[PDB]
């Protein structure tokens, strides 16, 4: 398996659907290596739950929490962590407003080497229970022989890209992790790192982050050949008064680069209502009425969540994926799993028009490029050399009575799976 792309375990589906899936307990297990230290980058944390996901033998080993919390929320997280002597925290500077530290990554240092995990789940019980989530597992990276001179770099430049990503934080405790990475051989890595980092970027630096990073990687490492772009996510930024402000202009332009139908997959009310969680799935799908009412044009790009291929049509998506299928969806030019939702905050927007890219948040993803495997395209694995696309193709359009799930309005005409209504406030 050259991909090492996985879904999380979903509670309440048949065991056959969890056979190739991983729980956080699986990732942290002694079978994955003899843990010495770990860093956990995320947005939301439940420290008590988190510490229990580590096996008993590893629970006292040092853990770093990399979060973006401020003020009182910062205090609460510190309070939450206080009991656990072995836990430190690193607050990621969020200088631009409406930015979040959204990246989901684990750095796992073991006796036998190093592992990097990039995924889509918050570190809270609910994100790993009945959600469709994604995970990329690096190989076990060996330590570089104390007597030798080598870069430990891959053809995808992953090691140097991860180090730059970590460097942008400008944080003391990450420098230690940067130095651990320096010591290790990451040359077997076959994915490309796509990061977002808060700032305003100019010159050659435009290419470093966000969708421009993607544009660049697709220019240099894909080739040209009516191939649709598919984008799938769980949160929706304010995109502008029409598609030309951002969506089809700079964002789709980046996505269509190589060497055009746009499908966007976002759960409908109906998807959420009849899900395994019911309406409380929508607590993880924060599309507000305020933002939605500003951009009604967007919703005609919207397609339902369907995932019979992976038995997860009723496990609401918290995964975020972007890809470029052929016209019949039998193959793809590339695949991206990432923390980046459909927002300017996450992907970046052009300022002082043309000259500046403005990114608000920290985001991280891995891009699977056929060229990194020596191929021209991947075949889509129909039932979750052939990439495991975790939802159904082609994506199905919203029916005329469907609406996008919007989290802050009531749904009281029909009960959900659990016979409840949804009344926010």
């Amino acid at each position: 398996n050259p991909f090492q792309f996985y879904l999380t375990r979903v509670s309440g589906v048949k065991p056959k659907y969890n056979s190739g899936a991983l729980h956080i307990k699986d990732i942290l297990s002694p079978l994955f290596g003899t843990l010495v230290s770990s860093a956990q980058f995320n947005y939301c944390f439940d420290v008590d739950w988190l510490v229990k996901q580590y096996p008993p033998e590893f629970r006292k080993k040092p853990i770093l929490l990399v979060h973006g919390d401020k003020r009182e929320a910062k205090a609460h997280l510190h309070a939450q962590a206080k009991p656990y002597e072995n836990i430190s925290l690193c607050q990621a500077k969020l200088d631009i407003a409406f930015g979040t530290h959204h990246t989901k990554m684990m750095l796992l240092l073991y006796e036998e080497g190093l592992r990097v995990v990039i995924h889509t789940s918050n570190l809270i019980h609910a994100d790993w229970h009945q959600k469709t989530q994604g995970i990329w597992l690096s190989p076990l990276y060996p330590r570089i022989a104390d007597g030798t001179h080598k870069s430990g770099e891959s053809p995808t430049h992953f090691k140097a890209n991860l180090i730059s990503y970590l460097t942008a934080y400008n944080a003391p405790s990450l420098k230690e992790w940067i130095d651990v990475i320096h010591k290790h051989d990451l040359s077997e890595t076959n994915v490309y790192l796509i990061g977002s980092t808060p700032g305003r970027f100019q010159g050659s630096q435009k290419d470093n982050w966000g969708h421009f990073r993607l544009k660049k990687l697709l220019k240099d490492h894909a080739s040209s050949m009516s191939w649709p772009v598919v984008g799938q996510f769980s949160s929706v930024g304010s995109l502008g008064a029409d598609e030309s402000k951002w969506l089809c202009s700079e964002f789709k332009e980046s996505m269509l680069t190589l060497g055009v139908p746009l499908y966007l997959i976002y759960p409908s009310v109906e998807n959420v209502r009849t899900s395994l969680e019911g309406y409380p799935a929508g607590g993880s799908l924060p599309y507000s009425i305020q933002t939605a009412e500003k951009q009604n044009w967007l919703h005609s790009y919207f397609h339902k969540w369907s995932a019979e291929t992976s038995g997860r049509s009723n496990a609401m998506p918290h995964i975020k994926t972007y890809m470029r299928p052929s016209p019949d969806f039998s193959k793809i030019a590339w695949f991206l799993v990432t923390s980046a939702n459909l927002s300017k905050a996450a992907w970046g927007a052009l300022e002082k028009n043309g000259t500046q890219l403005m990114i608000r948040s920290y985001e991280l993803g891995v891009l699977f490029l056929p060229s990194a495997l020596g191929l021209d395209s991947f075949k889509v694995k129909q039932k979750f050399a052939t990439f495991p696309v975790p939802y159904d193709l082609p994506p199905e359009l919203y029916g005329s009575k469907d609406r996008p799930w919007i989290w802050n309005i009531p749904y009281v005409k029909a009960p959900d799976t659990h016979g409840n209504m949804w009344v926010p406030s």
Partner: peptide, 5 residues
Amino acid sequence: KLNYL
């Protein structure tokens, strides 16, 4: 932050 809410 313990969740989005």
